[PDB]
Structure 1
Amino acid sequence: VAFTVDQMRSLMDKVTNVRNMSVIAHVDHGKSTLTDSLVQRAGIISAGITIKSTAISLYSEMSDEDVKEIKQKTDGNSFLINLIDSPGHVDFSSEVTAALRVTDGALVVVDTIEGVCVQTETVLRQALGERIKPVVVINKVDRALLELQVSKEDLYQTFARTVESVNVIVSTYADEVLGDVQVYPARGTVAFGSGLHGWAFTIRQFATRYAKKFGVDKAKMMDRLWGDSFFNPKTKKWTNKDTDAEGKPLERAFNMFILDPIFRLFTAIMNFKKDEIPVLLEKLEIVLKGDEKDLEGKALLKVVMRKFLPAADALLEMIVLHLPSPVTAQAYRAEQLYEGPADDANCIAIKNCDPKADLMLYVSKMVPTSDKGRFYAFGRVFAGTVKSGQKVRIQGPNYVPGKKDDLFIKAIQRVVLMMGRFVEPIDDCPAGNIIGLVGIDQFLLKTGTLTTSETAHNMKVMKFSVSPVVQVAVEVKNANDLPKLVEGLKRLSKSDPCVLTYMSESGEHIVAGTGELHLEICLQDLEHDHAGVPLKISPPVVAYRETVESESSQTALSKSPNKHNRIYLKAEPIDEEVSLAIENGIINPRDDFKARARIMADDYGWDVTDARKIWCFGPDGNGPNLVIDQTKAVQYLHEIKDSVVAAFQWATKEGPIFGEEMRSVRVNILDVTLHADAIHRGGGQIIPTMRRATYAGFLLADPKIQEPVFLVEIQCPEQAVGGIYSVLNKKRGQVVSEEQRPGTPLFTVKAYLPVNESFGFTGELRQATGGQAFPQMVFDHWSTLGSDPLDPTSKAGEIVLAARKRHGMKEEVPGWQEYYDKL
């Protein structure tokens, strides 16, 4: 239905009547299908900026009578349901947690024949760990009838086992505090149906029908519609034993009033018994409408079943009556979501979903919009209310109430509703709702916390990293489409904050990503959408870093082609702390050279003298590399600065070991001699000099290479935890910590995995832990290899040579002599 901004806003005020949930379901189990059906039924539409569909608004109204069946405060017969999108494959670990983290309820889809598949089982645990109330749906029932032609009782027994399996997981992993959260068909928390034909039902639906035909309060009618309850056709009495006084068998109630009607329609229709169909149909009061009347076979059955048991309603019924509202769940989820004091003024405001308290808005992800290459923040207001214009504290991942690091006191340009694919501006938005923000993209990379209290900690952060550690070279298979690749790459980078497309000096087009799979995906979308043109992709490669271990053996020297200019310098190491300080904004290229020097001098043991002579950082003008101007009395010096810097941006982006980036390289310019006339000191002359002197200084300062390393966090039942260590021990893995979730048998091992050893990791982890493990890895740090990159046989040298050949360079690494003046 269509709603006006007022309607939505008004609906968003009655949080007691909102449902934040997700759909846990394997893709091959109609996940997308069932989801759709809710959209095509209760999907909310507003009465030119497009976004990537992240959430869908659903509206559903119930009877005052129904509202009473809700065992949790409510108000009104209207309900707002926020169906938050989820990934297709489990591998997306990090973003699976993301969706769960902002949801309260969960529609778990299980298969009739196959039951609960491993992947779904895994996600469910995770859900449970965040304290998510499950609700089940046994999909693909049709296959049972049509293909397997199972009996009513066999099918019953199947559902029975299936529901049993689910509850084995539910009880084993849900929190004792939450209370029994197991699903019970008799309690209306389990639906059955088929996404394909588009039908589904709940015991509560047939209990409302047969409600009076037996003169019962549905409470007892649905209670009998499951388990061991029998209705003797002959005696016309309800019993609790599957046999009558004589010993003859009795059909279960479920099989009698639920599975039978359905089974007949299937048998009638699929057998084309035109004599029965009409009769059978009229009995269930299913009125075909003109054109439908002539249908037969699947075509017909599909129509009949939809009219009979609309799948969408069965599911919307369980979501409203059984899933928690943003008020019931925050009370017991708050402590888990607040990384601060469990009695903190905000943690309290979270429990109470208080719209009056200091803002506590959680940003789960950044979504691509059509409006430029800008991204809108997606998240949930756990406390207070967010409003357009409002100025908020944007607390990034590294923020801590103590310091001022990773903080951005800015103003929220606009607040918009994420109506699926379109946004709709709204003034404010009270706690308990999922909303979208405009104007944070340059403050928040992906995740973060927005507040108002100056003493507010962040909320359970989701580790993400923008460090390109895996990349490939893209080439068009047919040179004609070259311009179409040049555009898609531009497009690609525009859709994802963490993908990177750039051009090497060699002129190749590069695509670098956060990981094997994240890059994998990126490449697919490029060859299929952004470019749609056939491409030649090179094998995946790990991104290394070039660095020095000491001060240049001796002073480095180079002279321009004129032979009129000379640059003397020495390169020396930068301390990891300083490098980290740079990478993390503490030591910043845009600061005041004075203010910044004070920092380096004080907190990092740098001569304020050196630090005030920083000429530039690099690469891309902000990398963990620096040029200090230690020259003394060199006339015109300033006239060659822009060039020296320019030179530095290239020297640091593609070092001399094998073209990789430099890291932690301090270059100190000891002297400079220039031609008196400017004509002979232009970029054409100095840039090459500086560039070559740096290489010289670098190669003299004892060269080494750094490899990137991940920090994998793994969830896994104590039983399979074995397979974890098994695999880590074949990849140079280093366990950091292993802990167990208090109640459950769920361990959570954390380790360091070298990125150049992570290829096909998830795949191997899957075989090893029976599919029970749930990996989550992020970039953690750079590790300097001990071995000599210069020695071909060494372990680093092995990497280097291979790399150099790959790049078709001279197999051997250049001596410093090559770059030093050829004197």
Structure 2
Amino acid sequence: GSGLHGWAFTIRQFATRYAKKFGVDKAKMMDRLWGDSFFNPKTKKWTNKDTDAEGKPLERAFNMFILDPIFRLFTAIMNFKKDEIPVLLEKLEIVLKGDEKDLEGKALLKVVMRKFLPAADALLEMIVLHLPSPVTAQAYRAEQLYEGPADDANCIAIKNCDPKADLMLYVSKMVPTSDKGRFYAFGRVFAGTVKSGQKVRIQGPNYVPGKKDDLFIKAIQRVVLMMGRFVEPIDDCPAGNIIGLVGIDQFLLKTGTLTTSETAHNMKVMKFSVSPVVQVAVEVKNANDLPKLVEGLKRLSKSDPCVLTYMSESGEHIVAGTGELHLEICLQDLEHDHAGVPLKISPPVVAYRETVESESSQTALSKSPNKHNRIYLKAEPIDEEVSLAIENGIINPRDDFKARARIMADDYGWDVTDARKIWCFGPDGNGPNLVIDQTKAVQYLHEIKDSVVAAFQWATKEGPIFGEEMRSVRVNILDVTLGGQIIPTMRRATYAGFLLADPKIQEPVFLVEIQCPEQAVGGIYSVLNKKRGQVVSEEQRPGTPLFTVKAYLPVNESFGFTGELRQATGGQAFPQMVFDHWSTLGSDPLDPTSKAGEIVLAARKRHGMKEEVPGWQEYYDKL
């Protein structure tokens, strides 16, 4: 059929009319209609052969009893055969009336065949004949509509579809209306009866029945009916039906389970396999009107089930969506409805991480401005795995130095006297850069340590290349010759140690899981070969040609990876971007031709600092 001309048909109804004129029932009619179906009009004999004993081809039954009426009515009323309109009408038992007699052409087709085959009888009859009712549907669908112990009483209630069982709902989306922000909770009542003023437990996705996280035992203000665009309050709603309700809005975020029993767990909080991948930096054009942006971001996160608003490491408001279509529609809604403020859109400026890979060539010396105390140190790279352990919390800055040193030395292979003599970690009191003491002849190793930790915190929150954080730097303090005097010394000393330890930059690296067909793997491999994609590996399940690629991808090309990949491969591919880890780069920041030099110079022109990359010459104190 077609909705533009408003019609639909099935061979089931054609059987309903063909049964009386042929004497054979519905199912056998349509069996001699689909497949190898042929009928012989010279002997009135249905056969499974396109030809006969004489051998001229016959035509199919689907073409002689159905498509032949459709074809001849098209030919007659498109080529203006008024000698053929009424006879075909009375043959096909159509009746016309008034103006509908008087119509001609495309609108004649519209009316006479809306009278022949309405869309209602067909589309309605399939959706009630074969499409499932909630009792059977939940009776085989109970174990994914609930993530947990499948033998629970609420689950057997779902499997039995009891209208008066324990009430559970699932607010699936936070549907928008013209209430100037306040939405409605569009959700399905799988079990129970929702009432206006019933005490219901709001369960978040992070909730487990043995805890209290995101759980609100609250009452419902009103329950409303949904018919697409209008609003209409209803008193109660039973199991197996989808209803709207208001009052959950100020307590529930986006999606949520709505139970009445504490034994019942949560359910499957979606699966997507789409994910918010494309990310944009949002800020304001008016710092005074920034509160409307923050409220609008919160409201947009409530509105769209797959939008994600979060803060970056560099401070901008990262909005993450699925594609360029979805971002542009979320942004137009945010700028005109959610916030009402003109915004600015930008690429998601990335936080980079300065890191040396060498031991310092010559001893790192710095001196006090009053010239009384001197500091000698070295800077050396730390292993990737052991820095990951520090950032994962195996190596927690609050334990006893002894047992830490035991784990550091026996598992990770360090000098254990140092590992007991560990001083500090940076940044933020938990970072992977650590300061180690080697000094043995210094008498007062107590009046310097707090200043040491403080301005190491300052250096590691602002390194020397372009004023950004550090990673995997171990600082060997070799000698000190003895906060107003010590802090600049170690600032300059860490600076000289870094620049003499030959720095580079770590760029962030995503792990992306692309679901793709085996006939579009070529396009995806072409895209990753455009942009430096080191695919970790290659998995799939055998029953389907769907095929997942797990891959490492950098961010400066991930800006636009999504559009380029989908343009090259069609919509066949689906990415799953999650952040993996930090990988090293192979270019020098001091050389502006290379990638590291270009990115640091772009950062300096962005932040309005000095143009050159400062070094151990002017960060050294000579006689």
Fold agreement, TM-score > 0.5: yes
Q: From the superposition, tell whether residues 412 and 699 of structure 1 become closer, same or farther in structure 2 (CA, over 3 Å).
A: farther
Do the aligned residues in 1 keep the contact of 2:354 with 2:470 (CA within 8 Å)? yes
What SS does structure 2 have at the residue aligned with 1:337?
Answer: coil
Q: CA deviation at 1:264?
A: 0.9
Deviates more, 1:761-770 or 1:505-514: 505-514
Which moves more between the two structures, 631-640 or 768-777?
Answer: 631-640
> 2:594 & 2:415 partners in 1: Cα distance?
37
2: distance between equivalents of 1:384 and 1:614? 61
Deviation at residue 603 of structure 1 after TM alignment: 22
- Deviations 1:590-624 (CA, angstroms, capped at 9, x unpaired): 99999999999999999999999999999999999
* TM-fit CA distance, 1:388: 4.0
The alpha-carbon distance between structure 1 residues 792 and 433, as it changes in their structure 2 partners (threshold 3 A), is farther
Distance in 2 (CA, whole Å) between partners of 1:480 and 1:686 is: 41
Task: Say which is worse superposed, 387-396 or 205-214, in terms of deviation.
Answer: 387-396
CA distance 1:778–1:409, change in 2 (3 Å): farther
Corresponding position of 2:241? 433
Matches within 5 A, 1:128-207: 193-207=1-15
Asked if 1:419 corresponds to 2:227, the answer is: yes
Counterpart Cα distance in 1 of 2:520 and 2:129: 37
Q: Deviations over 1:495-550 (max 9, x none)?
A: 55876999999999997767766434434667899899999865665577999999
Q: Which of 430, 435, 451 is the matching residue for 1:627?
A: 435
485-494 or 625-634: bigger deviation:
625-634
In structure 1, the residue corresponding to 2:257 is in which secondary structure? strand
Bigger shift: 390-399 or 572-581?
Answer: 572-581
User: What is the rounded CA distance, in whole Å, between the counterparts of 1:387 and 1:615 in structure 2?
Assistant: 62
Q: SS in structure 2 opposite 1:626?
A: strand
State the alpha-carbon separation in 2 of the partners of residues 416 and 341 from structure 1.
32
The alignment covers a number of residue pairs equal to 623
1:477 alignment partner in structure 2: 285
State, as a whole percentage, how many aligned pairs show the same letter: 100
The answer as to whether partners of 1:373 and 1:494 remain within 8 angstroms in 2 is no
1:210 positional shift: 1.7
Distance 2:134 2:44 in 1: 46
Equivalent-residue separation in structure 2 for 1:622 and 1:226 (angstroms): 71
Maintained 8 Å contact 2:273/2:575: no
Deviation sequence 1:170-210 (CA, Å, 0-9, x none): xxxxxxxxxxxxxxxxxxxxxxx233322221111211122
RMSD of the alignment, in Å? 8.5
| CA-to-aligned-CA distance 1:301-325 (integer Å, 9 cap, x gap) | 1222222112343222222111122
Match of 2:75 among 253, 258, 267: 267
1:64-89: per-residue Cα shift (whole Å, max 9, x none)? xxxxxxxxxxxxxxxxxxxxxxxxxx
- The answer to whether the 8 A contact 2:347-2:559 is kept is no
Aligned to 1:715: 515
Aligned match of 1:818 in 604, 618, 622? Answer: 618
Alignment CA distance shift 1:363-1:482 (3 Å): closer
Deviation at 1:267, TM superposition (A): 0.5
The answer to whether the 8 Å contact 1:338/1:459 transfers is: yes
Does the residue aligned with 1:336 lie in a helix, a strand or coil? coil
**3-state DSSP of counterpart to 2:593:** coil
State the alpha-carbon separation in 2 of the partners of residues 652 and 578 from structure 1.
18
Q: CA deviation at 1:421?
A: 1.9
Residue 537 of structure 2 corresponds to: 737
Rounded Cα–Cα distance in structure 1 between residues aligned with 2:415 and 2:224: 50
Q: Contact conserved, 1:445 with 1:497, CA < 8 A, in 2?
A: no
**1:278-677 paired onto structure 2 within 5 Å:** 278-462=86-270, 496=304, 518-523=326-331
Unaligned runs of 5+ in 1: 1-192, 675-682
Is the alpha carbon distance of 1:344 and 1:314 closer, same or farther for their aligned partners in structure 2, counting shifts above 3 Å?
Answer: same
Structure 2: which 5+ residue stretches go unaligned? none
- How far is 1:397 from its partner? 3.4
1:693 and 1:374 map into 2 onto residues whose CA distance is 57
| Contact 1:364/1:378 (8 A) holds in 2 | yes
Cα 1:207–1:468 change in 2 (3 A) is closer
Which range moved further: 584-593 or 810-819? 584-593
Q: Specify whether residues 513 and 329 from structure 1 end up closer, same or farther in structure 2 by C-alpha distance, changes over 3 A only.
A: closer
In structure 2, the CA distance between the partners of 1:803 and 1:410, relative to structure 1 (3 Å rule), is farther
Q: Is the 8 A contact 1:472 1:537 kept in 2?
A: yes
1:358 Cα deviation after fit:
4.2
Q: For residue 283 of structure 1, report the CA deviation from its aligned partner.
A: 2.3
Q: Whole-Å Cα distance in 2 between the matches of residues 622 and 533 of structure 1? A: 38
TM-score by length of 1: 0.50
Residue number in structure 1 paired with 2:563: 763
SS at match of 2:20: helix
Q: Name the SS of the counterpart of 2:617 in structure 1.
A: helix
The TM-score with structure 2 as length reference comes to 0.64
**Retained in 2: the 8 A contact 1:470–1:543?**
no
Shift of residue 341, structure 1, vs aligned partner: 3.2
Residues 567-603 of structure 1: CA deviation (Å, up to 9, x unaligned): 9999999999999999999999999999999999999
Q: Which moved more, 1:367-376 or 1:274-283?
A: 367-376
What secondary structure sits across from 1:492 in the alignment?
helix
SS of the residue corresponding to residue 165 of structure 2 reads coil
Query: Out of 701, 705, 714, which is 2:501 matched to?
Result: 701
Contact 2:6 2:119 (C-alpha < 8 Å) held by counterparts: yes
Preserved CA contact (<8 Å) 1:470 1:540: no
CA contact (8 A) 1:388 1:415 kept: yes
Q: Give me the whole-angstrom Cα distance separating, in 2, the residues matched to 1:461 and 1:534.
A: 34
Q: Cα distance 1:672–1:800, how it changes in 2: closer, same or farther (>3 A)?
A: same
**SS across alignment from 2:128:** helix
Q: Which deviates more, 741-750 or 464-473?
A: 464-473
* Cα 1:315–1:473 shift into 2, 3 Å: same
Deviation at 1:350, TM superposition (A): 3.4
Q: Per-residue CA shift, 1:604-659, capped at 9, x if unaligned?
A: 99999999999999999999999999999999999999999999999999999989
CA contact (8 A) 1:471 1:511 kept: yes
SS at match of 1:279: helix
Range with bigger deviation, 212-221 or 596-605: 596-605
Q: Residues 470 and 542 of structure 1 are in contact (CA less than 8 Å); yes or no, is this contact kept in structure 2?
A: no
Provide closer, same or farther for how the CA distance between residues 711 and 790 of structure 1 changes in structure 2, counting only shifts above 3 A: same
Greater alpha carbon shift after TM alignment, 309-318 vs 810-819: 810-819
For 2:251 and 2:476, the matched residues in 1 are separated by: 33
Q: Is the CA contact (8 Å cut-off) linking 1:711 and 1:750 kept in structure 2?
A: yes
The answer as to whether partners of 2:334 and 2:340 remain within 8 angstroms in 1 is: yes
Contact 2:314 2:351 in 1 (8 A): no
C-alpha distance in 2 between matches for 1:591 and 1:414? 53
Q: 1:778 to 1:293 in 2, by over 3 A?
A: farther
Moved more, 521-530 or 237-246: 521-530
1:683-702 deviations in whole A, cap 9, x for unaligned? Answer: 99999999999999999999
Following superposition, the deviation at residue 557 of structure 1 comes to 21
Separation in 2, partners of 1:313, 1:685: 90
**TM superposition shift of 1:258:** 0.4
Change in Cα spacing, 1:633 to 1:716, as seen in structure 2 (3 Å) is: same
Q: 2:174·2:185 contact (CA, 8 Å) conserved in 1?
A: yes
Relative to structure 1, the CA distance from residue 287 to residue 349 in structure 2 (aligned partners, 3 Å threshold; closer, same or farther) is same
Query: 1:366 and 1:509, CA in 2 relative to 1: closer, same or farther beyond 3 A?
Result: closer
653-662 vs 442-451, greater mean Cα deviation = 653-662
Distance 1:396 1:733, change over 3 A: farther
Contact map agreement 1:712 1:778 (CA 8 A) in 2 = yes
In structure 1, C-alpha distance between the alignment counterparts of 2:418 and 2:151, rounded to whole Å: 47
Cα separation, partners in 2 of 1:718 and 1:471, compared to 1, 3 Å: closer
Q: Aligned partners of 1:545, 1:468: CA distance in 2, in Å?
A: 25
Contact 2:154 2:166 (C-alpha < 8 Å) held by counterparts = yes
Distance 1:259 1:638, change over 3 A: farther
Secondary structure of the residue aligned to 1:748 is strand
Q: CA deviation at 1:726?
A: 6.0
Distance 1:370 1:594 in 2: 64
Shift of 1:744: 3.6
Give the corresponding residue for 1:800: 600
Distance 1:296 1:595 in 2: 93
In structure 2, distance between residues paired with 1:575 and 1:386 = 58
Is the CA contact 1:465–1:779 (under 8 Å) kept in the aligned structure 2?
no
Matches of 1:578 and 1:326, distance apart in 2: 54
Q: Distance in 1 between matches of 2:579 and 2:509?
A: 6
Larger deviation, residues 687-696 vs 220-229: 687-696
Question: Does residue 780 in structure 1 map to residue 580 in structure 2?
Answer: yes
8 A contact 2:357–2:503 mirrored in 1: yes
